[PDB]
Amino acid sequence: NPKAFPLADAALTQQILDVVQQAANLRQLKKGANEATKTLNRGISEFIIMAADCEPIEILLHLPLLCEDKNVPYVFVPSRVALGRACGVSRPVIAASITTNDASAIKTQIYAVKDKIETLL
Amino acid sequence: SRVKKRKKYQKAQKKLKSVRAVYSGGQSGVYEGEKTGIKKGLTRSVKFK
Amino acid sequence: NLRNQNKLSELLRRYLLGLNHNSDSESESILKFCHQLFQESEEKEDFFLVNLESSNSLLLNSTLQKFALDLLRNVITRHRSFLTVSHLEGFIPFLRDSLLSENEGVVISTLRILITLI
Amino acid sequence: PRAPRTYSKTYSTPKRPYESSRLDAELKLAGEFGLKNKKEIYRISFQLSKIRRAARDLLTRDEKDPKRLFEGNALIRRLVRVGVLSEDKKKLDYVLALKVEDFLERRLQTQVYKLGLAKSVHHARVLITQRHIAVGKQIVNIPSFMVRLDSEKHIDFAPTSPFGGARPGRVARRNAARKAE
Amino acid sequence: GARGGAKVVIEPHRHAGVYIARGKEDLLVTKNMAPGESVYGEKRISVEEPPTKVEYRVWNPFRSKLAAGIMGGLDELFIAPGKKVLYLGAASGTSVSHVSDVVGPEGVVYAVEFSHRPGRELISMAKKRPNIIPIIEDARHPQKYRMLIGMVDCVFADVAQPDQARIIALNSHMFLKDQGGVVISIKANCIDSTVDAETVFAREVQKLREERIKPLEQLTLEPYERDHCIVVGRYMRSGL
Amino acid sequence: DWFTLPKPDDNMRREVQRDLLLIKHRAALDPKRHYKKQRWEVPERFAIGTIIEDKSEFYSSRMNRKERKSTILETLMGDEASNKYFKRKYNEIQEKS
Amino acid sequence: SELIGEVIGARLISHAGSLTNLSKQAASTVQILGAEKALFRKNKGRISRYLANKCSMASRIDNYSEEPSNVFGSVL
Amino acid sequence: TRNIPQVSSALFFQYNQAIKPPYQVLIDTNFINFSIQKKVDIVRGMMDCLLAKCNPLITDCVMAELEKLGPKYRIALKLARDPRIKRLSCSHKGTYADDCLVHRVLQHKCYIVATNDAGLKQRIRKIPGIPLMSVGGHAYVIEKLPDV
Amino acid sequence: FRKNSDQLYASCADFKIRTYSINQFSQLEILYGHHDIVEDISALAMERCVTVGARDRTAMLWKIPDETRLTFRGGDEPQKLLRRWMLFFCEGSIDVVSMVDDFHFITGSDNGNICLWSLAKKKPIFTERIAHGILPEPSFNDISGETDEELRKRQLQGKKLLQPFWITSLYAIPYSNVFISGSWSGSLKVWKISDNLRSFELLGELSGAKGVVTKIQVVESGKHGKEKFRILASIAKEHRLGRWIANVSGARNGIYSAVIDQTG
Ligand SMILES: [Mg+2]
Ligand SMILES: [Zn+2]
């Protein structure tokens, strides 16, 4: 019913943010709304993460429209500042995307969180 | 030997493209059409008998 | 199997006879115990998992229900005091349920107690 | 005389080495993981065969048998520790489902390539054999090193490496000197 | 390549209702139903005919799985002019609009979709295309929309769901005609990522056989997509 | 009918005939391009069309108007690099002949 | 409308083809969407690009709000 | 219209990079006798030969093949109906098993063909990337399976 | 700094801890074992330093002479916590640590959890959830552009979007039962450890500080019997590591001071 939906629980958010930090170190992470929009256009996005307290929230309601057109899992995290911390950037991040790479060292973790997100949806 | 097998493999990958098409990252840039042409009366379809 | 059930039934009967001479039968805790027995009685994964090999719950509940009804009748008959409406009011909903039970023997025990409370 | 020191062969020749499908398999594996010769593939195959045969013997045994429980638990623990088997497939059935590619993917060469310290598997091997990669505090110069789950995060450039903050190699300072002169 | 100002020569495809635009690079192109506009920003080709200006739309294999099938060289496409069509998993007009062109004004396309956000664009696009009837519902409960759907000659399903076979069976039984067409696009990663691609196809084909659908084809969609194939089958109501 | 292409007119112009020739022999136009082998015949029905871009595709995939021409041939005339390759390649074949 | 102007904003929607289309499109292309009529127009280019993102900023709010307000447009 | 069937994406030249454990195995009618004849259990014998979980499959043609045999081979029929053995439906009028098995493997490169028939085996070997399983001596043997 | 000595312990973002001898101006050792940035470090008279691994959620005490390390992990899950109760925020990262004793230490998490630890026990012995409270809920007039107020309220999703304060600072006076915690809640909280060293309680609060408390220090003077304590805490408008935290109303850059006297 709320525009930001589904919203990941405290436990799931924790699991999500760990993956985001790992992707950041391996240069598998795309940060920011417009970058995530570009990746969806490319069909290289594994899944995307949005902050539910985005100010205002209507800024990131286009990515879900792109996702369900492209069948890409997505999920909301409560805190943008917390999301900003995991990405490794000095500023809040309101959207991020995991790039697809079939040779990545954190393959197993991404599918682990991916499967949960599809269950949530 | 490692160098020899390296060259042998990369040579093998090129041949596999000739035998069958292989995914090469998908679309890059605007869709410029099929470069090598469309064949009309040809089907690569494996039929159930 | 049925033969082992008969062996068990004799054993439970011998337990009931023991309770008759037990001083706990004279105490009121036994009715609570009978109450306790009554309420207690009432593809892709297979794709990987190796297989190398080519319902008694109703019976359990029936046996427990039989034991509690038989015990309850024995206690009230032996000590007149517990044969009262106040003490046996709570067991009425169990009696009506037992009257419907498929097993005839527990129903027979249900009839035996009802005749006692008539 | 001194008591014997035991030894054992770590690999075994395959049954029919000249099978065309087998030759293609070895070619593909060596190409992916930058293996020097067929001896490495034979070694990994022999180790996998031993593991799978032991798993088979244990599975044949009845459930809740002391030997089955003990030995299967030990084998699952070891396979999980080395990282080949994941935390959520801790059963002997998934041990029988293992493949050579999993063990190859745990090699320090492949891990160095994946983590981004190197631009190719061969570059990873060259970096390893030149004493540039340290797993924690220890320099490892062996591509066949098997990396555990915990050690995975500690792979880095060694402190002594020119890439790890030490002084530039002989070539770099030689060029700098001649340029200075 | 096919820049804005170039010219190309159009000529009929082997399948009715499809066209090729030759040149330095050829393009698979379908005749537009609502000329003068693009639904997902595709390139369009204008032809002067005695004069009226008919307009054509470029069909992108990389964006639509159906076109990739034609690129692969599918022998039989039940999608044809004057043919009723039931498009399952119609995320938007990216592929439905092209299918709407092929059937033509006489035929109709029944677009079925579940999620609301992509549904709205389907409604807006459908208002431009009279032959498209949008059904914003779950394909898992066909009895919900049983009135809105008559007989359909061919059923096309691109739903990305693990148990899509069940959805296909229920719709085919109620709606698809005798000897009717069935076209399916399968992505093995959704159904079972544990096992390889080909086995997932083998399991899917068996399920279709169990559902009285005789398979006529499978075709892999590479190089346009990984781990994808299109299965074409005919429905034998009496018995497989 | 809605799905029928216009017929070519008999005694068709020289430009349209030639455009068919270029498509027939498109393999030789560029040294660095190759095409699937195909025996191409003139289709019984066809038409000549002009591409229309998306307005977002301005910089990427648009031809400026001066270079837009009435026939595919004289566009290839506009390309200097293509002309240079043809001028050379015709020189050797004549020398060998 | 408030950010740029009614007529210019109406044009930008027509270039996109629909308000929904404009919102879905990335920031860089929105700049190039109005690059024909100089809708948004080295220092000059920076303002155009900066304004383009904000123009993309406003479009999303209007499209996905049932009754969009002008409070965010003003501060934008 | 001409047809040249595509080369399956699962095959790297003569290497089938798709058949990996657990395996799916097609059982031919004669395979059951030689399994019984040698006192080799179908599941365990397959599992011992490949050291992996093996999922046998019997098609309608092979199942229909057994019923016509008669009382003499009742045991083979009973084993074939073992619940662990999954069934495959058939969409070809002929009840012949040779064309059935050959067609299935030509199409989907996932199956190990379990047969001892010389004629059928020769047909399969020409088909690339098809592991061929047979029973000989005391236990099963896999020929074209590099992972072993 | 190791108390009353010249050894210096430095925690670096390369997941390593370095040790230094200032009197000699040279590097002694490089210490390995953390999986993620070693954000904070503490030291006492002995050589047993403790460190915190941020997202790795592992506090490690290191025995330099013995060249061994002890690993401590919280292992707290809001699922079980709620059921034993029949808002709890899962631990996200650990960012402050200070050693009360050579056999005890405390750590602060980004979920507002202050945990007491003992060397014997790997798990926490005592925990204080949401020590600094919950952050203010975002304003409804700003969450969404929809005119109708009821629509904007829905976007708040009740209390689901609420998040707890972070423990930006945490300091314990050596070999004492009192430690101070800090955040941008606008007040310093002083906690007292029980004499039995299995629990602590909130002794008091100081609201003078307004801004992000990046670090806290304590200095004392006077006779042994009668001592006055001065608490100095650096105050900033932004978090020390980054600028993620939204501007806090009334925040100012300065050094907070609070003098406290003992009487009884
Ligand atoms: Mg060295
Ligand atoms: Zn058959």
PDB file of N, CA, C and O in Angstrom, chain B:
ATOM      1  N   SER B   1      54.681 -24.954 -21.276  1.00  0.00           N
ATOM      2  CA  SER B   1      53.412 -25.617 -21.552  1.00  0.00           C
ATOM      3  C   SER B   1      52.237 -24.692 -21.281  1.00  0.00           C
ATOM      4  O   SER B   1      51.255 -24.691 -22.034  1.00  0.00           O
ATOM      5  N   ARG B   2      52.313 -23.899 -20.213  1.00  0.00           N
ATOM      6  CA  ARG B   2      51.201 -23.020 -19.869  1.00  0.00           C
ATOM      7  C   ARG B   2      50.906 -22.052 -21.005  1.00  0.00           C
ATOM      8  O   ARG B   2      49.744 -21.841 -21.371  1.00  0.00           O
ATOM      9  N   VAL B   3      51.948 -21.460 -21.586  1.00  0.00           N
ATOM     10  CA  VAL B   3      51.745 -20.555 -22.712  1.00  0.00           C
ATOM     11  C   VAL B   3      51.143 -21.303 -23.890  1.00  0.00           C
ATOM     12  O   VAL B   3      50.235 -20.804 -24.563  1.00  0.00           O
ATOM     13  N   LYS B   4      51.641 -22.509 -24.164  1.00  0.00           N
ATOM     14  CA  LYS B   4      51.127 -23.279 -25.290  1.00  0.00           C
ATOM     15  C   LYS B   4      49.642 -23.565 -25.122  1.00  0.00           C
ATOM     16  O   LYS B   4      48.854 -23.392 -26.059  1.00  0.00           O
ATOM     17  N   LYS B   5      49.234 -23.992 -23.926  1.00  0.00           N
ATOM     18  CA  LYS B   5      47.817 -24.243 -23.692  1.00  0.00           C
ATOM     19  C   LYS B   5      47.011 -22.955 -23.714  1.00  0.00           C
ATOM     20  O   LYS B   5      45.845 -22.965 -24.123  1.00  0.00           O
ATOM     21  N   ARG B   6      47.602 -21.841 -23.280  1.00  0.00           N
ATOM     22  CA  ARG B   6      46.902 -20.566 -23.362  1.00  0.00           C
ATOM     23  C   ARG B   6      46.550 -20.237 -24.805  1.00  0.00           C
ATOM     24  O   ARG B   6      45.404 -19.900 -25.117  1.00  0.00           O
ATOM     25  N   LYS B   7      47.529 -20.338 -25.705  1.00  0.00           N
ATOM     26  CA  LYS B   7      47.262 -20.034 -27.105  1.00  0.00           C
ATOM     27  C   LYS B   7      46.295 -21.038 -27.709  1.00  0.00           C
ATOM     28  O   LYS B   7      45.434 -20.668 -28.514  1.00  0.00           O
ATOM     29  N   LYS B   8      46.418 -22.312 -27.337  1.00  0.00           N
ATOM     30  CA  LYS B   8      45.506 -23.312 -27.877  1.00  0.00           C
ATOM     31  C   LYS B   8      44.068 -23.019 -27.476  1.00  0.00           C
ATOM     32  O   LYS B   8      43.154 -23.126 -28.301  1.00  0.00           O
ATOM     33  N   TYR B   9      43.840 -22.647 -26.215  1.00  0.00           N
ATOM     34  CA  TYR B   9      42.473 -22.394 -25.777  1.00  0.00           C
ATOM     35  C   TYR B   9      41.877 -21.197 -26.502  1.00  0.00           C
ATOM     36  O   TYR B   9      40.784 -21.286 -27.071  1.00  0.00           O
ATOM     37  N   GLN B  10      42.580 -20.062 -26.491  1.00  0.00           N
ATOM     38  CA  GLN B  10      42.027 -18.864 -27.112  1.00  0.00           C
ATOM     39  C   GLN B  10      41.774 -19.097 -28.594  1.00  0.00           C
ATOM     40  O   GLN B  10      40.834 -18.539 -29.167  1.00  0.00           O
ATOM     41  N   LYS B  11      42.604 -19.922 -29.230  1.00  0.00           N
ATOM     42  CA  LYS B  11      42.313 -20.346 -30.593  1.00  0.00           C
ATOM     43  C   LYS B  11      41.021 -21.150 -30.644  1.00  0.00           C
ATOM     44  O   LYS B  11      40.221 -20.995 -31.574  1.00  0.00           O
ATOM     45  N   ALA B  12      40.799 -22.018 -29.654  1.00  0.00           N
ATOM     46  CA  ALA B  12      39.586 -22.826 -29.643  1.00  0.00           C
ATOM     47  C   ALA B  12      38.342 -21.956 -29.516  1.00  0.00           C
ATOM     48  O   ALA B  12      37.319 -22.229 -30.152  1.00  0.00           O
ATOM     49  N   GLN B  13      38.409 -20.905 -28.697  1.00  0.00           N
ATOM     50  CA  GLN B  13      37.246 -20.043 -28.517  1.00  0.00           C
ATOM     51  C   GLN B  13      36.828 -19.405 -29.833  1.00  0.00           C
ATOM     52  O   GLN B  13      35.632 -19.297 -30.128  1.00  0.00           O
ATOM     53  N   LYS B  14      37.798 -18.974 -30.639  1.00  0.00           N
ATOM     54  CA  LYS B  14      37.466 -18.373 -31.926  1.00  0.00           C
ATOM     55  C   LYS B  14      36.724 -19.365 -32.808  1.00  0.00           C
ATOM     56  O   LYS B  14      35.741 -19.008 -33.467  1.00  0.00           O
ATOM     57  N   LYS B  15      37.176 -20.618 -32.828  1.00  0.00           N
ATOM     58  CA  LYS B  15      36.513 -21.627 -33.645  1.00  0.00           C
ATOM     59  C   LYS B  15      35.095 -21.892 -33.167  1.00  0.00           C
ATOM     60  O   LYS B  15      34.197 -22.104 -33.991  1.00  0.00           O
ATOM     61  N   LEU B  16      34.870 -21.887 -31.851  1.00  0.00           N
ATOM     62  CA  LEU B  16      33.534 -22.158 -31.334  1.00  0.00           C
ATOM     63  C   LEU B  16      32.527 -21.144 -31.857  1.00  0.00           C
ATOM     64  O   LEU B  16      31.351 -21.471 -32.052  1.00  0.00           O
ATOM     65  N   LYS B  17      32.968 -19.906 -32.089  1.00  0.00           N
ATOM     66  CA  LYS B  17      32.078 -18.911 -32.674  1.00  0.00           C
ATOM     67  C   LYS B  17      31.643 -19.325 -34.072  1.00  0.00           C
ATOM     68  O   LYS B  17      30.473 -19.167 -34.440  1.00  0.00           O
ATOM     69  N   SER B  18      32.573 -19.851 -34.869  1.00  0.00           N
ATOM     70  CA  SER B  18      32.219 -20.312 -36.208  1.00  0.00           C
ATOM     71  C   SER B  18      31.250 -21.484 -36.151  1.00  0.00           C
ATOM     72  O   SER B  18      30.284 -21.537 -36.920  1.00  0.00           O
ATOM     73  N   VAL B  19      31.491 -22.436 -35.249  1.00  0.00           N
ATOM     74  CA  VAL B  19      30.627 -23.608 -35.153  1.00  0.00           C
ATOM     75  C   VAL B  19      29.214 -23.195 -34.765  1.00  0.00           C
ATOM     76  O   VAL B  19      28.230 -23.632 -35.370  1.00  0.00           O
ATOM     77  N   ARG B  20      29.095 -22.347 -33.748  1.00  0.00           N
ATOM     78  CA  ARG B  20      27.813 -21.813 -33.322  1.00  0.00           C
ATOM     79  C   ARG B  20      28.052 -20.422 -32.765  1.00  0.00           C
ATOM     80  O   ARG B  20      29.162 -20.084 -32.350  1.00  0.00           O
ATOM     81  N   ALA B  21      27.002 -19.613 -32.757  1.00  0.00           N
ATOM     82  CA  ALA B  21      27.090 -18.314 -32.112  1.00  0.00           C
ATOM     83  C   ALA B  21      27.262 -18.494 -30.607  1.00  0.00           C
ATOM     84  O   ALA B  21      26.781 -19.471 -30.026  1.00  0.00           O
ATOM     85  N   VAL B  22      27.943 -17.541 -29.971  1.00  0.00           N
ATOM     86  CA  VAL B  22      28.186 -17.559 -28.531  1.00  0.00           C
ATOM     87  C   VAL B  22      27.973 -16.154 -27.993  1.00  0.00           C
ATOM     88  O   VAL B  22      28.374 -15.170 -28.624  1.00  0.00           O
ATOM     89  N   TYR B  23      27.337 -16.061 -26.829  1.00  0.00           N
ATOM     90  CA  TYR B  23      26.995 -14.764 -26.266  1.00  0.00           C
ATOM     91  C   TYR B  23      28.256 -13.949 -26.012  1.00  0.00           C
ATOM     92  O   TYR B  23      29.256 -14.463 -25.505  1.00  0.00           O
ATOM     93  N   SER B  24      28.201 -12.669 -26.370  1.00  0.00           N
ATOM     94  CA  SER B  24      29.368 -11.791 -26.358  1.00  0.00           C
ATOM     95  C   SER B  24      29.024 -10.471 -25.677  1.00  0.00           C
ATOM     96  O   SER B  24      29.337  -9.387 -26.169  1.00  0.00           O
ATOM     97  N   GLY B  25      28.363 -10.558 -24.525  1.00  0.00           N
ATOM     98  CA  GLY B  25      28.036  -9.391 -23.736  1.00  0.00           C
ATOM     99  C   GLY B  25      26.714  -8.731 -24.064  1.00  0.00           C
ATOM    100  O   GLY B  25      26.301  -7.820 -23.337  1.00  0.00           O
ATOM    101  N   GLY B  26      26.037  -9.154 -25.128  1.00  0.00           N
ATOM    102  CA  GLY B  26      24.752  -8.576 -25.471  1.00  0.00           C
ATOM    103  C   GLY B  26      24.870  -7.337 -26.334  1.00  0.00           C
ATOM    104  O   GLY B  26      25.749  -7.258 -27.196  1.00  0.00           O
ATOM    105  N   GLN B  27      23.991  -6.364 -26.111  1.00  0.00           N
ATOM    106  CA  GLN B  27      23.951  -5.156 -26.923  1.00  0.00           C
ATOM    107  C   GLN B  27      24.871  -4.095 -26.333  1.00  0.00           C
ATOM    108  O   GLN B  27      24.837  -3.838 -25.125  1.00  0.00           O
ATOM    109  N   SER B  28      25.685  -3.483 -27.189  1.00  0.00           N
ATOM    110  CA  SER B  28      26.504  -2.330 -26.827  1.00  0.00           C
ATOM    111  C   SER B  28      26.216  -1.223 -27.830  1.00  0.00           C
ATOM    112  O   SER B  28      26.387  -1.414 -29.039  1.00  0.00           O
ATOM    113  N   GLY B  29      25.781  -0.073 -27.331  1.00  0.00           N
ATOM    114  CA  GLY B  29      25.399   1.027 -28.190  1.00  0.00           C
ATOM    115  C   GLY B  29      24.000   0.862 -28.742  1.00  0.00           C
ATOM    116  O   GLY B  29      23.259  -0.066 -28.407  1.00  0.00           O
ATOM    117  N   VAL B  30      23.633   1.801 -29.616  1.00  0.00           N
ATOM    118  CA  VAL B  30      22.323   1.742 -30.243  1.00  0.00           C
ATOM    119  C   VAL B  30      22.257   0.517 -31.149  1.00  0.00           C
ATOM    120  O   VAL B  30      23.265   0.076 -31.715  1.00  0.00           O
ATOM    121  N   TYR B  31      21.059  -0.041 -31.285  1.00  0.00           N
ATOM    122  CA  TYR B  31      20.864  -1.193 -32.157  1.00  0.00           C
ATOM    123  C   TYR B  31      21.105  -0.768 -33.598  1.00  0.00           C
ATOM    124  O   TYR B  31      20.299  -0.036 -34.180  1.00  0.00           O
ATOM    125  N   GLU B  32      22.209  -1.229 -34.178  1.00  0.00           N
ATOM    126  CA  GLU B  32      22.579  -0.892 -35.544  1.00  0.00           C
ATOM    127  C   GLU B  32      22.152  -1.958 -36.543  1.00  0.00           C
ATOM    128  O   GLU B  32      22.577  -1.912 -37.701  1.00  0.00           O
ATOM    129  N   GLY B  33      21.324  -2.914 -36.126  1.00  0.00           N
ATOM    130  CA  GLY B  33      20.909  -3.988 -37.002  1.00  0.00           C
ATOM    131  C   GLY B  33      21.865  -5.157 -36.961  1.00  0.00           C
ATOM    132  O   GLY B  33      22.896  -5.154 -36.282  1.00  0.00           O
ATOM    133  N   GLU B  34      21.509  -6.192 -37.714  1.00  0.00           N
ATOM    134  CA  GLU B  34      22.361  -7.362 -37.867  1.00  0.00           C
ATOM    135  C   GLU B  34      23.431  -7.049 -38.901  1.00  0.00           C
ATOM    136  O   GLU B  34      23.120  -6.780 -40.066  1.00  0.00           O
ATOM    137  N   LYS B  35      24.692  -7.084 -38.472  1.00  0.00           N
ATOM    138  CA  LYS B  35      25.780  -6.666 -39.347  1.00  0.00           C
ATOM    139  C   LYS B  35      25.983  -7.650 -40.492  1.00  0.00           C
ATOM    140  O   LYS B  35      26.233  -7.239 -41.630  1.00  0.00           O
ATOM    141  N   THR B  36      25.874  -8.945 -40.216  1.00  0.00           N
ATOM    142  CA  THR B  36      26.218  -9.969 -41.191  1.00  0.00           C
ATOM    143  C   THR B  36      25.053 -10.369 -42.083  1.00  0.00           C
ATOM    144  O   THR B  36      25.241 -11.197 -42.979  1.00  0.00           O
ATOM    145  N   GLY B  37      23.870  -9.820 -41.866  1.00  0.00           N
ATOM    146  CA  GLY B  37      22.750 -10.088 -42.743  1.00  0.00           C
ATOM    147  C   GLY B  37      21.787 -11.119 -42.179  1.00  0.00           C
ATOM    148  O   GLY B  37      22.147 -11.980 -41.369  1.00  0.00           O
ATOM    149  N   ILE B  38      20.535 -11.023 -42.619  1.00  0.00           N
ATOM    150  CA  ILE B  38      19.483 -11.982 -42.304  1.00  0.00           C
ATOM    151  C   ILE B  38      19.330 -12.928 -43.484  1.00  0.00           C
ATOM    152  O   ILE B  38      19.269 -12.485 -44.638  1.00  0.00           O
ATOM    153  N   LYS B  39      19.256 -14.228 -43.205  1.00  0.00           N
ATOM    154  CA  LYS B  39      18.995 -15.240 -44.225  1.00  0.00           C
ATOM    155  C   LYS B  39      17.517 -15.616 -44.176  1.00  0.00           C
ATOM    156  O   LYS B  39      16.933 -15.746 -43.095  1.00  0.00           O
ATOM    157  N   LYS B  40      16.913 -15.763 -45.358  1.00  0.00           N
ATOM    158  CA  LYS B  40      15.459 -15.809 -45.463  1.00  0.00           C
ATOM    159  C   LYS B  40      14.905 -17.211 -45.245  1.00  0.00           C
ATOM    160  O   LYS B  40      14.109 -17.431 -44.325  1.00  0.00           O
ATOM    161  N   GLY B  41      15.291 -18.163 -46.089  1.00  0.00           N
ATOM    162  CA  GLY B  41      14.736 -19.499 -46.087  1.00  0.00           C
ATOM    163  C   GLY B  41      15.429 -20.472 -45.161  1.00  0.00           C
ATOM    164  O   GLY B  41      15.202 -21.682 -45.268  1.00  0.00           O
ATOM    165  N   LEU B  42      16.257 -19.978 -44.249  1.00  0.00           N
ATOM    166  CA  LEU B  42      17.100 -20.807 -43.402  1.00  0.00           C
ATOM    167  C   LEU B  42      16.566 -20.841 -41.980  1.00  0.00           C
ATOM    168  O   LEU B  42      16.245 -19.796 -41.406  1.00  0.00           O
ATOM    169  N   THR B  43      16.480 -22.043 -41.421  1.00  0.00           N
ATOM    170  CA  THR B  43      16.056 -22.260 -40.048  1.00  0.00           C
ATOM    171  C   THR B  43      17.069 -23.143 -39.338  1.00  0.00           C
ATOM    172  O   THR B  43      17.467 -24.189 -39.857  1.00  0.00           O
ATOM    173  N   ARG B  44      17.480 -22.718 -38.147  1.00  0.00           N
ATOM    174  CA  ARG B  44      18.348 -23.505 -37.288  1.00  0.00           C
ATOM    175  C   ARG B  44      17.551 -24.209 -36.205  1.00  0.00           C
ATOM    176  O   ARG B  44      18.017 -24.323 -35.067  1.00  0.00           O
ATOM    177  N   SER B  45      16.356 -24.667 -36.546  1.00  0.00           N
ATOM    178  CA  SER B  45      15.385 -25.151 -35.584  1.00  0.00           C
ATOM    179  C   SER B  45      15.411 -26.671 -35.520  1.00  0.00           C
ATOM    180  O   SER B  45      15.330 -27.353 -36.545  1.00  0.00           O
ATOM    181  N   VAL B  46      15.499 -27.191 -34.300  1.00  0.00           N
ATOM    182  CA  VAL B  46      15.653 -28.621 -34.064  1.00  0.00           C
ATOM    183  C   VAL B  46      14.269 -29.184 -33.770  1.00  0.00           C
ATOM    184  O   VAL B  46      13.738 -28.997 -32.673  1.00  0.00           O
ATOM    185  N   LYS B  47      13.695 -29.899 -34.733  1.00  0.00           N
ATOM    186  CA  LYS B  47      12.291 -30.290 -34.671  1.00  0.00           C
ATOM    187  C   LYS B  47      12.073 -31.571 -33.884  1.00  0.00           C
ATOM    188  O   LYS B  47      12.910 -32.479 -33.892  1.00  0.00           O
ATOM    189  N   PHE B  48      10.931 -31.630 -33.200  1.00  0.00           N
ATOM    190  CA  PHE B  48      10.449 -32.874 -32.617  1.00  0.00           C
ATOM    191  C   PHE B  48       9.860 -33.727 -33.729  1.00  0.00           C
ATOM    192  O   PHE B  48       9.044 -33.244 -34.520  1.00  0.00           O
ATOM    193  N   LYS B  49      10.256 -34.993 -33.786  1.00  0.00           N
ATOM    194  CA  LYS B  49       9.774 -35.875 -34.843  1.00  0.00           C
ATOM    195  C   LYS B  49       8.537 -36.630 -34.371  1.00  0.00           C
ATOM    196  O   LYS B  49       7.643 -36.048 -33.755  1.00  0.00           O
TER     197      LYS B  49
END
